[PDB]
Amino acid sequence: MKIGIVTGIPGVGKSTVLAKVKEILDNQGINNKIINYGDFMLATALKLGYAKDRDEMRKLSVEKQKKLQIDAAKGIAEEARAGGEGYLFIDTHAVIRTPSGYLPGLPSYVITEINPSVIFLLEADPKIILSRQKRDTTRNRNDYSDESVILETINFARYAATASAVLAGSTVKVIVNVEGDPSIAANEIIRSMK
Amino acid sequence: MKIGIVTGIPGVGKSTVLAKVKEILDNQGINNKIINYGDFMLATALKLGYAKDRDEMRKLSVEKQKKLQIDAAKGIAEEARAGGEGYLFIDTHAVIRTPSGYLPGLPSYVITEINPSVIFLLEADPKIILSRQKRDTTRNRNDYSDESVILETINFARYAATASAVLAGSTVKVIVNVEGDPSIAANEIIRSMK
Amino acid sequence: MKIGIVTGIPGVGKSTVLAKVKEILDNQGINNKIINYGDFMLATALKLGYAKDRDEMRKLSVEKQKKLQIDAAKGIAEEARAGGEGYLFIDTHAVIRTPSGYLPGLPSYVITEINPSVIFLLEADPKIILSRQKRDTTRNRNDYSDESVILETINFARYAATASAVLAGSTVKVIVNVEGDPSIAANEIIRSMK
Numbered sequence: 263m264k265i266g267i268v269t270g271i272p273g274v275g276k277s278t279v280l281a282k283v284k285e286i287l288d289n290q291g292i293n294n295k296i297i298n299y300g301d302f303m304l305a306t307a308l309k310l311g312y313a314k315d316r317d318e319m320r321k322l323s324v325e326k327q328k329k330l331q332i333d334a335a336k337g338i339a340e341e342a343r344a345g346g347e348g349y350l351f352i353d354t355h356a357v358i359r360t361p362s363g364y365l366p367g368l369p370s371y372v373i374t375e376i377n378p379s380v381i382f383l384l385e386a387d388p389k390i391i392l393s394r395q396k397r398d399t400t401r402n403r404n405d406y407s408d409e410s411v412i413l414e415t416i417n418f419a420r421y422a423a424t425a426s427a428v429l430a431g432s433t434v435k436v437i438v439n440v441e442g443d444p445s446i447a448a449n450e451i452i453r454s455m456k
Numbered sequence: 457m458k459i460g461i462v463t464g465i466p467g468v469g470k471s472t473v474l475a476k477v478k479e480i481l482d483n484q485g486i487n488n489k490i491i492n493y494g495d496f497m498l499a500t501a502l503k504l505g506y507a508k509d510r511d512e513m514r515k516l517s518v519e520k521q522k523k524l525q526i527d528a529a530k531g532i533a534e535e536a537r538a539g540g541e542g543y544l545f546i547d548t549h550a551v552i553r554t555p556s557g558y559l560p561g562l563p564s565y566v567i568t569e570i571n572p573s574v575i576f577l578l579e580a581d582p583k584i585i586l587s588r589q590k591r592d593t594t595r596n597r598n599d600y601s602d603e604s605v606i607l608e609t610i611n612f613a614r615y616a617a618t619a620s621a622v623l624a625g626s627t628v629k630v631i632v633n634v635e636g637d638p639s640i641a642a643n644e645i646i647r648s649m650k
Numbered sequence: 651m652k653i654g655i656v657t658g659i660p661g662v663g664k665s666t667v668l669a670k671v672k673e674i675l676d677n678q679g680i681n682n683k684i685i686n687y688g689d690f691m692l693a694t695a696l697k698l699g700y701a702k703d704r705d706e707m708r709k710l711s712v713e714k715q716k717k718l719q720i721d722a723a724k725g726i727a728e729e730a731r732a733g734g735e736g737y738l739f740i741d742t743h744a745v746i747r748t749p750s751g752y753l754p755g756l757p758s759y760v761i762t763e764i765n766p767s768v769i770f771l772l773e774a775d776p777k778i779i780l781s782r783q784k785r786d787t788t789r790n791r792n793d794y795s796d797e798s799v800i801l802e803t804i805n806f807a808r809y810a811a812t813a814s815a816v817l818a819g820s821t822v823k824v825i826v827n828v829e830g831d832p833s834i835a836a837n838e839i840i841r842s843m844k
């Protein structure tokens with residue numbers, strides 16, 4: 263399975279687009295799997311003892327976390343080798359905004375274990391992302407004060423994703439998520455895996 | 457020792473802010489060391505005959521600067537091991553303007569010796585930085601002619617620091633140094649270390 | 651020999667600038683070699699039987715191209731150590747635009763084998779790049795639709811070149827290619843190599 267990492271800053275509509283990518287690939291009868299990196303990390307944590315739930319996993323020693331990310335990364339690469347023909351997409355972050363600053367989602371020890379073909383950056387107009395902050399308060403962590411915060415996050419995601427791309431030899435692709443339709447992004451993503 | 461790297465372009469008030477961090481951590485009795493990267497570079501340079509003053513080290517061939525960089529990094533790595541517990545702040549740069557172009561302050565061979573937790577980008581409005589540079593003649597710097605050169609250097613600092621963050625697994629925090637109030641930045645810096 | 655990597659996005663006048671670097675150095679009797687990374691790749695293909703022309707080379711498996719990229723990188727490093735004093739310049743790309751997104755021209759497994767001192771980024775005004783687009787069809791590049799795509803390509807190139815510079819510890823030099831005279835750029839390239 264050819265691997266593609268789909269990243270997006272909160273509010274871009276990454277879950278809707280991913281739902282559309284699966285729907286379109288199933289309809290063409292094309293083998294595909296969509297893995298949520300955080301969920302697979304937790305699954306990995308459960309299988310190897312490290313922790314029994316998220317809070318437990320999150321309050322873990324930095325040296326343990328780095329091991330766990332490596333094992334999850336190795337695990338996902340296995341899933342891809344085992345699934346044969348198809349497309350495996352990872353749903354993760356290029357950068358995670360934290361109070362302590364931007365944390366790269368694909369650091370060297372993770373990215374070179376996975377070796378993806380493509381890293382996607384889901385972007386939209388900062389205005390459209392601010393509207394999707396108060397329109398759908400399905401988490402509402404209201405971290406995006408003004409659009410200058412969104413812009414800055416977009417940019418750090420761009421810098422971090424390219425640095426991860428340079429490490430693995432993968433391409434970086436910007437995909438605009440159209441407000442109306444999620445199918446535009448979904449087809450651009452599918453076109454890129456060809 | 458928990459390492460935090462504090463970078464900033466010349467004129468952001470890196471020192472002002474760093475003094476205030478020592479004040480605040482000394483006053484609450486927390487063990488903290490503040491090392492200036494360039495001071496360690498100059499020591500090694502002086503003993504080898506490469507340069508006499510800090511403002512000439514950046515004019516050196518890329519290969520000599522690389523040598524000083526590795527030596528300094530090995531030194532600071534040693535001081536961090538003999539610190540036991542508490543916060544170590546490395547006062548340095550994300551990028552160094554040189555006749556040969558921008559030299560990354562935290563290349564892979566430096567990042568592997570230190571392994572910071574957080575990498576800070578101290579920033580300020582370019583107009584405010586342009587002024588601060590003319591008020592200091594214990595340094596100088598004729599390369600910061602207009603506001604265009606400062607923007608471009610703030611950007612390369614961002615690109616470079618994020619690439620370094622991605623290699624290390626560390627976070628990158630942009631801190632605005634509020635004109636006239638070093639304690640804001642100093643406190644964001646302290647909170648981010650927790 | 652000191653290694654310099656000269657990159658530019660299509661349409662900046664890189665081959666012209668590279669010719670002046672050769673003439674100015676010849677008329678100074680400085681030893682210099684100017685290698686095209688893809689050509690060196692092609693050469694290694696032939697002498698290993700993989701491919702026979704640029705066209706059949708660009709069709710090879712991903713694992714095969716990667717093979718060619720490493721050996722070519724290693725090879726170019728031997729050529730520079732063998733060549734004694736002097737300046738070796740590699741003409742390649744910082745990023746390449748592909749249907750899958752931006753492909754880093756200097757991934758880790760390549761930049762760490764070459765270990766340049768300088769990575770140059772030739773830029774020009776977007777308008778100028780477009781102006782040369784209608785003017786020459788040695789090629790006929792109809793990929794640059796508008797100036798916003800030129801801008802994006804430029805930033806990705808900076809992002810990637812900086813990341814590559816952080817892995818090898820090389821500088822990143824932006825060189826503006828002036829439209830009237832290609833010597834402004836070649837003198838800067840040469841100055842930067844001292």
Ligand SMILES: Nc1ncnc2c1ncn2[C@@H]1O[C@H](COP(=O)(O)O)[C@@H](O)[C@H]1O
Nearest residue numbers: 493494510513514525548549552561562
């Ligand atoms: N991490 C670094 N890598 C390379 N050169 C550095 C680094 N940190 C500082 N320098 C150099 O040391 C000089 C003085 O440091 P500063 O006193 O903090 O300006 C700089 O202008 C650079 O020439």
